[PDB]
Amino acid sequence: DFNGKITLAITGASGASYAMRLIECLIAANYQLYILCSSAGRISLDTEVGVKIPSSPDAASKFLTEKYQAKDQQITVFGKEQWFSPVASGSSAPKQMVVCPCSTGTMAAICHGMSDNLIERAADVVIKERGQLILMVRETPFSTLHLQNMLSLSQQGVTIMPASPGFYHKVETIEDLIDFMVGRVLDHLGIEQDIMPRWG
Amino acid sequence: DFNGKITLAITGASGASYAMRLIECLIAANYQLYILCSSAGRISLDTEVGVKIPSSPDAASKFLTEKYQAKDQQITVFGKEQWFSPVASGSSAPKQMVVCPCSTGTMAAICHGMSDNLIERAADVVIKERGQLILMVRETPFSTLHLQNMLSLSQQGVTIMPASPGFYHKVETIEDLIDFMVGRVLDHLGIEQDIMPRWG
Amino acid sequence: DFNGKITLAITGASGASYAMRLIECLIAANYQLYILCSSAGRISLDTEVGVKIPSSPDAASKFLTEKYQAKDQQITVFGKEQWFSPVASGSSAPKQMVVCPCSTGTMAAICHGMSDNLIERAADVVIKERGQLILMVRETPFSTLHLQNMLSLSQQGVTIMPASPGFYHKVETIEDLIDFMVGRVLDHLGIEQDIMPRWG
Amino acid sequence: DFNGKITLAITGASGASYAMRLIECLIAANYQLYILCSSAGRISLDTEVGVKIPSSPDAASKFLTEKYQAKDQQITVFGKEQWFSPVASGSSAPKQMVVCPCSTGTMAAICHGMSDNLIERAADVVIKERGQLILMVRETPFSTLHLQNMLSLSQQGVTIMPASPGFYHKVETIEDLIDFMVGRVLDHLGIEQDIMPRWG
Amino acid sequence: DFNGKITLAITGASGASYAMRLIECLIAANYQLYILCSSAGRISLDTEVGVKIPSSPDAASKFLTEKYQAKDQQITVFGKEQWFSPVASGSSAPKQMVVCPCSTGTMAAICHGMSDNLIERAADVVIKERGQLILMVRETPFSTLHLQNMLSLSQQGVTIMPASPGFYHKVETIEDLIDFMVGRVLDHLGIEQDIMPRWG
Amino acid sequence: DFNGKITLAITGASGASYAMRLIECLIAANYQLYILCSSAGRISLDTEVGVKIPSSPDAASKFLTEKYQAKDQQITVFGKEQWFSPVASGSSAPKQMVVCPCSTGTMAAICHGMSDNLIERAADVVIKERGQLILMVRETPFSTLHLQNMLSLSQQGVTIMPASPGFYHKVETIEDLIDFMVGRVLDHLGIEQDIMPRWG
Amino acid sequence: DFNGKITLAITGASGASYAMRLIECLIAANYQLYILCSSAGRISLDTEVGVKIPSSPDAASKFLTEKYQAKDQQITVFGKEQWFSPVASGSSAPKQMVVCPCSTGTMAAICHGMSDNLIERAADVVIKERGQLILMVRETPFSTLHLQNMLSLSQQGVTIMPASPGFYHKVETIEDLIDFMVGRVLDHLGIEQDIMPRWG
Amino acid sequence: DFNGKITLAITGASGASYAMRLIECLIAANYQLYILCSSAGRISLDTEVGVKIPSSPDAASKFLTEKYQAKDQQITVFGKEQWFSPVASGSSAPKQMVVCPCSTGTMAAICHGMSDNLIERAADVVIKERGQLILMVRETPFSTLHLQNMLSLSQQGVTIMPASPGFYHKVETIEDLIDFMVGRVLDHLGIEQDIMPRWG
Amino acid sequence: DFNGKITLAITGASGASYAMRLIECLIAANYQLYILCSSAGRISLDTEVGVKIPSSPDAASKFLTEKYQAKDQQITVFGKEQWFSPVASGSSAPKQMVVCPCSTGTMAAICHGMSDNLIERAADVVIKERGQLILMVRETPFSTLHLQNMLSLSQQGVTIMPASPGFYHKVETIEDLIDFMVGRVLDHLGIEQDIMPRWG
Amino acid sequence: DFNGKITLAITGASGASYAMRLIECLIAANYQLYILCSSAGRISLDTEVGVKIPSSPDAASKFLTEKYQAKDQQITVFGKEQWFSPVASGSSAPKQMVVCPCSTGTMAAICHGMSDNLIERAADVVIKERGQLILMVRETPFSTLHLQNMLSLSQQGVTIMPASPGFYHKVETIEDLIDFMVGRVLDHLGIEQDIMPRWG
């Protein structure tokens, strides 16, 4: 008895911390998560935050389940070519999906409809079902070609959310900046920011 | 005998720290600066970082000169409607200009050619002279209309550089993230990153 | 314990009566209102309907509160440059906003992302959050440039609702025509037309 | 010896009163009128204002002639498929045509060149002769597709005049609002507003 | 008993002399003028040609009336926010308007429909009434964004007339070059060049 | 040992004086010039400024060499169909070319890639090599079709520089206006304005 | 044993003679014809050339069969709403269709995919099967909207063939002008012009 | 004392008879004509109708003057490169110009702004002055590229009038078909069809 | 009794050898050729391969006939302004045309519909008849404007075939590279590569 | 102490010889090279020119170093998924990159921002840093879709340089044709052609 199901995709764009905080807040918000991680996403998590997700999808699910202390079936990891997954079909796919962080190469593939891996096929499905797809892009600067990619998607209802946190405080901390972006994701997903737990 | 002249514009987009670090690095790089600050830019600097720029352009120049310990004529502040300034003419305007941070409302005015204040007129001049204009946008998400604004400018040679720093370290610090963006500005300006001084 | 929060903006386009009836119906529907009025909006209200809104935002809130007999905190007026207001941030801004009536100059500024006053910044925020923005345009004829403005916004999900009431009765009255437009606003906002009170 | 010839088309868009006042003012201005009324236009006139135009074009001409007390040949009604009419040819068609009110379905047909009835063929002719076609649209809101229709026509020189009267008075009356729109039609047609007669 | 009414707007684009000669020729042609001058327009007139227009609209009207020796009511100056002026309404606005000279920032505002001052609202009105608006642009070079602005307006029937006089003589004089542009304005307005008086 | 090589093209657009002053300043700046003159360019030079360029390219080179007192090989004129010239090849063509003045017919041919004479082929070459092409257009008004031509070229990196000099002085002289445009050309070419010699 | 099957549609555009000569030449070329005639097409044939096609499709087939002396099954007329006809299906429809003459209203319907009668559905079918559709337009002038219609179709492979015969002779005759257009149709259909029989 | 001045251009598109009838009707209507004929136009007139226009512009003027019995100065022929002609300047050029007939190659040059001969420069001038240019195109079929050419011009206010006469009679004659097109030209020029003289 | 008729055009783009090999293979394939050569095409043939085509079209036909040993009427050369040629009419023009090699200036003229010489008129004819036009472009790099030219033509069915031979062998020879391109032309023309004769 | 750093990418498009000559000339010009080779690039080098690059990046660097006799660190090969390479970051990536030869599939991926291998990520980086990317395309013909790809990139500043060498000599050799293209690459890179060594 979860409050919703969300697809979470993690790519390699140097914003692993955002992804990890997102998952924590979504677990606390009592949502069911289907988690997809690219090759580069996995390696980013290790390098940036020391989280070593097993490549085996079963052992990966168990791993995140214990990390975050999640409920039975609350977290399921699917593999990069596991095309039988619920996220690959209009029928069983969550109506909300976040790509956090999102590389411009993945964003481009999504823009053009390439569907060369599970992340890209899941996004394609959310778009054809007129669901809610949030791409938390992490790249700078933005070339002309990537703005044309972004513009396309945006016109088609996808939320382009660059990881560009504001500095709203007098002494800013890395936790404020991560939460700035994560609370705005939750805001877009319709989930209350009051459920976000303490960092300490 | 400075190495170059650059126009620096500061708007209110919650990224004051980036602007302050930029100025420091540009002073250290031995460039001449012409500094423009919007109303909201001034108030942002006070709130976010406790820098209280006098509104008087003369007293403002002196103020930043002492703050950063700059050379005679190294820093000159111009006022929001001082249309006689060197930045308002093709003849005397620096060929490089950075807007750091850049609100989307200022970016929109620049995109459409509005020139309603000195920041917008200076940008307009850099664009017609086919100079180098770098807009360090700080906003999220990016609406469709603002991506169309960004795309226009980008197609016209303006560098759209969202303030989206990468997390390249194992324990990230607010100084790494500021420098991530500032070193990339300097990279685009053709200035060596080796001149950036210590934070302590 | 209100049923919702809505932003109401009033510009000068000669349709003050529509705005005044809207507010009445929204108060009766038990919504919380954040009210923005441009310079020309204020002067329009005086000329067209003899409503003299104090320019002071506090005294303006009190004034409308007594006029319409609203609940504590049910009506708050914000000032044209009060950038700290809840409507200027994605986090705290109502997800529904109506501009009633809407000048084409304000509509143009919104279309292009100009954000030169609080009305324009509030609209910009509703659009980037993919909220519901209803512009009740009052202008005729519609130039080519203003149709391109309207078309842009419409494509981006904004409801362009010209103040073009139908004549559905045998003896039409000015109250029928105002309500024609106001009931259609309420229809779009998802509020029941049965709550609209008697004119007498 | 009339001052001009104008084509007047009436569709069903709930603005019959505007059409009836227009005809009165044009008769008083001493113009020759060729009147076209769609099926829905006829039924609108009955419902909204109790004017029962005979479907027979001859008896319809006589009827309006007596209603408005017009001069011999001052008013001629043509039928929905009478393709031999002067309005269906470049040679004999008035150079000014007003569609009052104008449904969006008729406007769409005109935009796309469909010419499926006499109204649409007459408009097509005014457009190819680079005459003056005024469409007094009565619809709200304006969908995206209908703004693209409007924009096309406007770019091609057609005057899109939504029936969106302004409230310029202290106690507005239904007669002021009708005249607001009708005087603006006359303004566009180059006819003096001083000839508009009293309502009483 | 004047031959016509024209709106004349003067902006700051360094072409004050053209404006002053235009007014002289239009007075001599016996037209009624409504004159609008921006802030920068006023300061340009002082600097470039020593004409010090009082900012008070009444004293400004009187001033130009005596300067040029014009007939009662032949010249009326309106103020930058006097929104009750005849030029701000479709009903009473001249069907011909010249902006001489025209800054690109004003041209941009007109292109996008901004209407932030009386000049921009007057232009907006001429465009929606399908009048004749002549923009005598004075700027070089023309950026890409400003050509897109110009192209829009031109497509919408506005005459883009850069102040680019030809050198048609063997010894050219500053008076020949001013008249080159002014006679071409008069040519577009349908006024005879034979009425232009002697410079001496 | 010249400081650079530039291609200079002269067309018939009534701005011969600008061309003649340009050449003088470029000779003084110690650049090597390759000069192209159209049929109408030659006749313009005679009529407007009494410079009678021999049509023979050899005698034309000698002629300008003596006129301006240039160094051996400093000035070479090529003929309208001499397709073996260095300006007709990517390999040997200067990377900077100015068309001064530039007719709209030549500009159109350049925009569309027509290459029907040497001027048009030289421009085509500068554009494909991504060199610097400056078109000093002299025409007014600018039709819609010519703005589309200009816009194309501008988007493709060509500097559209209408001959629209500003009036920056209190008593303007024809020499100030010529230099206004010529100093701005030199500004774009990266050549110091301090080298421009006295007129007397 | 015919050489091919062609669909022939006749609309009302005042070019009945062309249609009648086409049919004659196609019968002589030994093609099988499926003939469609609109309401206005039928009336045009009577008025312009005294050919009174019965509205009954069976009696119409017999009628044309005797007129032109055609072979059993060589000519079959289908009715305006007979949706079971072979021309309404991809499977059984001729791959070549000519609309001769073609009204702009029919052309518009075809351009937009309206399929409101058999002519329009047959054309729609030829286009989706990537067959050969030839529209012999007869209209002048061509409005902007109708050129956009024509351009669309042309881009999509439809042959826009205005009935604009050339005057290639010294004494031109109405028969030369009809044949000019008909021989060019046959040229496009791949049928030899040598089979066209004598007029006398 | 003529009623107007018109520019008439004749190209080679096989419609010489139309041109010759036009001139006759315009002479009878008492207009002043400036006549331009291309190389191919001249040869077309000889071949198609036995009119041998001398290539010398003076002897050509005299020739047409006697042919049509025109008044002193009523007909003046200008030569293909006589750039001093009144039709080559905004100041002295007729505001109405007809190209009859018009080749698609000339139309293309006009569309793109090429101005390679006097016909093309005259058209360019009418377009920049926002005059009335009527192109009586004679070509079939219309390729895609030529419809894009036509569409451009049409959007820019040029009347594309293919030589596609209707068959409005029971026995059509070559004179009816020529007049069909010529009366429609006169209709567009605002000249009464009653002045067209007898053929016999 | 030839197998087909093809139009071959040779321009100056430094690829004369390709043209000469093409002709040889087409003669061997037993096709009838109509050969067009521009001014620059002729000079290219002399310089690059020592083939001196007489400018006289009759002597040129005879010359190529003997060179290649062709059959009576197998090769006919037409002159650059011989407008009576079969290639200038829809009726008699080959349905296949190759421009080998093709300059970008000729390609541009074809793209825009200029038809200023016989090559350009022949191409225009193949395009309007929806024939097969193959442009073997020889230019590098490809500017933006020339890619827009190429893209247009390609979209309109023209085969853009840059002369970019592949290196498919271990020791490549100039004959392999010529044939690479020529066999691909023949492939597109539907002619068997087995008929290509030995080089020796 | 090299003169510059360049990224060289080799794909499979049958132009291996060009790549090998490029490397030689760049080594001789004393530039530092970072070399990327696709799977198909490697196999092309073996087949076409017998160069067997080891797939191991270290052994590949050593191999090319000895082949060309390069200086320590002068040549470094990176592997197809080695994402830590200097070419994958804005900070350390050469500002000049050549893809020689370039397949259309790689070009398409670059156009759309796909970044699926190191070549595509390196190009993406040069484009976002507004560096110099030269694509030496080798393909014929160019489909419509690939011209749209090329056009995009070109508009965004990428140099599309088809491998289309000119035949500038009397007896052409395969070495002349390779150098034609390689000298033009060096020309674009700003490197002197005088440093290119002898083939023998």
Author numbering:
A (entry chain A), B (entry chain A), C (entry chain A), D (entry chain A), E (entry chain A), F (entry chain A), ...: 4 to 203
Passage from the reporting paper:
In prokaryotic organisms, several ubi gene clusters encoding a set of enzymes (UbiA, UbiB, UbiC, UbiD, UbiE, UbiF, UbiG, UbiH, and UbiX) produce ubiquinone from its precursor, chorismate. The monomer structure adopts a typical Rossmann-fold topology comprising eight α-helices (residues 19–32, 42–52, 60–71, 89–91, 107–115, 121–132, 147–159, and 177–192) and six β-strands (residues 8–13, 35–40, 78–81, 99–103, 135–140, and 162–165). The crystallographic symmetries of both crystal structures generate spherical dodecamers with dimensions of 105 Å × 93 Å × 95 Å. The monomeric structure of CpsUbiX is stabilized by two different patches of inter-subunit contacts, namely patches 1 and 2, to generate a dodecamer.
Moreover, a V47S mutation resulted in complete loss of FMN binding, allowing us to produce an FMN-free form of CpsUbiX without affecting overall structure of the protein. Therefore, mutating the Val47 to Ser significantly affected this hydrophobic interaction, resulting in the mutant protein having a low affinity toward FMN. FMN-bound CpsUbiX crystallized in the orthorhombic space group (C2221) with 6 monomers in the asymmetric unit, while FMN-free CpsUbiX crystallized in the cubic space group (P23) with one molecule in the asymmetric unit. The phosphate-binding site in FMN-free UbiX is occupied by a sulfate ion (SO4 II). On the other hand, the C-terminus is parallel to α7 in FMN-free CpsUbiX and is stabilized by Met199 and Trp202 through hydrophobic and hydrogen bond interactions. Tyr204 is exposed to the bulk solvent in the FMN-free CpsUbiX. In contrast to the FMN-bound CpsUbiX, the structure of the C-terminal region of the FMN-free CpsUbiX extends into a β-sheet region of the core domain with the conformational difference starting at the Glu195 residue. This in turn leads to the formation of a large solvent channel connected to the putative active site in the FMN-free form.
